[PDB]
Ligand SMILES: Nc1ccn([C@@H]2O[C@H](COP(=O)(O)OP(=O)(O)OP(=O)(O)O)[C@@H](O)[C@H]2O)c(=O)n1
């Protein structure tokens with residue numbers, strides 16, 4: 218299809234998303250529980266809610282519980298140690314006890330499979346959220362992607378379109394056999410928009426957690442006023458870029474620098490894979506996405522040679538189906 222047809226199917230697919238801040242009350246409900254553990258402890262919001270400034274249907278909320286001194290140290294990295302991890306699980310255990318006590322109908326899951334300790338909460342009516350502890354990086358990288366989407370608010374449509382597709386096609390980490398998170402696809406979307414000068418480079422070091430809102434304001438979204446021409450033009454060029462312009466053997470998707478970053482300058486090579494192990498397992502350096510804040514973290518670490526295969530196929534197949542909408 219032409220950019221226009223792609224644009225039109227996309228605006229048409231999002232028709233019921235635009236119909237109907239509502240997160241405040243949940244923030245307050247979560248703050249109740251947090252305060253019964255420690256009334257000096259803070260609650261911060263992060264994820265898509267903060268990144269877009271809109272709360273989507275079928276998205277959880279992301280919360281982190283911070284101490285005063287965790288905030289004031291607004292630019293510290295986050296310790297990747299066993300005691301750090303221990304500390305977070307201990308506080309999260311207490312808070313889970315309290316959440317269960319106060320809300321008997323809620324499922325409160327202490328998730329231990331992961332690299333970052335997390336409590337997953339389903340109350341059963343899209344009351345839906347995760348809680349973490351004592352980490353700045355979630356709030357920090359979310360303010361970074363929010364900084365960019367604010368330079369150019371309509372780009373939130375390209376990213377929302379890519380996100381929904383990733384989940385539909387099973388590429389998204391959230392689906393069985395998926396390899397890239399929603400977070401990784403955003404880093405790809407921004408990286409792309411920066412390469413096309415739709416966005417002005419922001420150094421990740423300029424983001425200060427002590428200057429961020431624990432609950433940031435709503436950021437109005439409006440329909441494309443061109444019957445989605447720019448959306449469809451962006452989408453087609455996005456796919457072209459990651460298909461025929463981005464050189465995955467030699468390059469890294471990164472917001473740490475403007476221009477090109479090579480795998481070679483990072484030591485993200487075959488030799489590194491043999492030495493590697495992350496979260497307990499094999500890291501892959503097939504599809505490279507650099508984390509702006511964490512040391513030596515590839516967000517694309519789960520992209521096996523096979524999943525690199527699937528990804529390209531879908532990038533080819535998305536050109537003709539308008540991200541699975543024109544079918
Ligand atoms: N490897 C990762 C994955 C996620 N995050 C943090 O956790 C937040 C939530 O991640 P995710 O749920 O994947 O992204 P959302 O944009 O919230 O998308 P959705 O919830 O709609 O799937 C991200 O914004 C990011 O700051 C992170 O620091 N590192």
Ligand SMILES: [Mg+2]
Nearest residue numbers: 264265277279
């Ligand atoms: Mg989320």
